[PDB]
């Protein structure tokens, strides 16, 4: 079995120009592709080429408005640049950011033709900038196009139309853009854990709580894990594994799994608060790659801490690799606000998901 790998220094030339140190770095990318180089793991991948995003490929999720206007940017002088990002919640712009959003998704479209034609086995996309927050019609939360869910799309038009595409995001943070994005679609699954905190955490809404499951053709096909009141790890991650994406994933039986893969509740990081460990990823991973016939491809969203990002994620790619995983520390039993968590979503999705009862 062969791993592809994705990685461009050209996306790191999107910038933040008034505040250099922004947590949305562009050695994000580099730190990531350095540690892969370390420990040996990227020569035993096969790499993939980036390449641009068409608009048409934009269009699979995107309006032609928000198309134009992010496009638009790519000429804008600073003072345009600022105004333009100061219209977004939580948006910076200089004028490659098009640019590297477009290679951010190139490349993941490449990564799914090489699984779906059976080049790789599965493959790991070191992108940025992110993609889960943006919408339709808008960009957010450091993300202006959606990565994960034009990738879905795209791998419906090179297979077929109702190809299952289960989308994991375990991005400490709400995939509201992803969730809006399918939310009346049975053939994309969406899978989001995240810190929710009644809604007080980012992106702020109660779109992210147990309770959002679809609406009209998609009622069943979204399913949030929401956490409050604890600073989870390891063993929550495993329970919400173990007792609702497996059984949940297992039974839609999806033909590709994206895992929106955000480092951002990890041990270390800045803004996310939780301390999920390298290993916890790479059970994750291996978890995953159970399904779909090992179809998975692991696509960087956010993270921010440099050495938690680098070792999480090359734990990721040495799982898709075939390397057994590494041993988890001792789990502690949950925090009971996660069992809670838990079984708010069990009782919400046991309805459309007899793997539950
Ligand atoms: N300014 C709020 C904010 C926006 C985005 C993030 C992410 O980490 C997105 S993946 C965090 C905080
Ligand atoms: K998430
Ligand atoms: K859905
Ligand atoms: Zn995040």
Known sequence: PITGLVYDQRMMLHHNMWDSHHPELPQRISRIFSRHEELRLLSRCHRIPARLATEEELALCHSSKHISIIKSSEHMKPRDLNRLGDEYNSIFISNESYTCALLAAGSCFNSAQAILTGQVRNAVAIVRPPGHHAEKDTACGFCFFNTAALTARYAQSIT????????????????????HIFEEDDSVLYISLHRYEDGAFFPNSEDANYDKVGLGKGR??????????????????????????????????????L??????????????????????????????????????????????????????MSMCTSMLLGDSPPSLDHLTPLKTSATVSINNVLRAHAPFWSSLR
């Open 259 to 312: 895992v929106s893969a955000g480092f951002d509740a990890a041990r270390g990081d800045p803004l996310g608060g939780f301390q999920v460990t390298p290993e916890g990823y790479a059970h994750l991973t291996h978890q995953l790659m159970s399904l779909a016939a090992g179809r998975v491809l692991i696509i960087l969203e956010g993270g921010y801490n440099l050495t938690s990002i680098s070792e999480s």
């Open 220 to 257: 069943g096909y979204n399913v949030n894990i929401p956490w409050n009141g604890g600073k989870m790890g390891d063993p929550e991650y495993m329970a919400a594994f173990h007792h609702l994406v497996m059984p949940i994933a297992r039974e839609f039986a999806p033909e590709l799994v």
């Open 160 to 179: 077929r139309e109702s190809l299952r595409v289960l989308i994991v995001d375990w991005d400490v943070h709400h995939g509201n853009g992803t969730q």
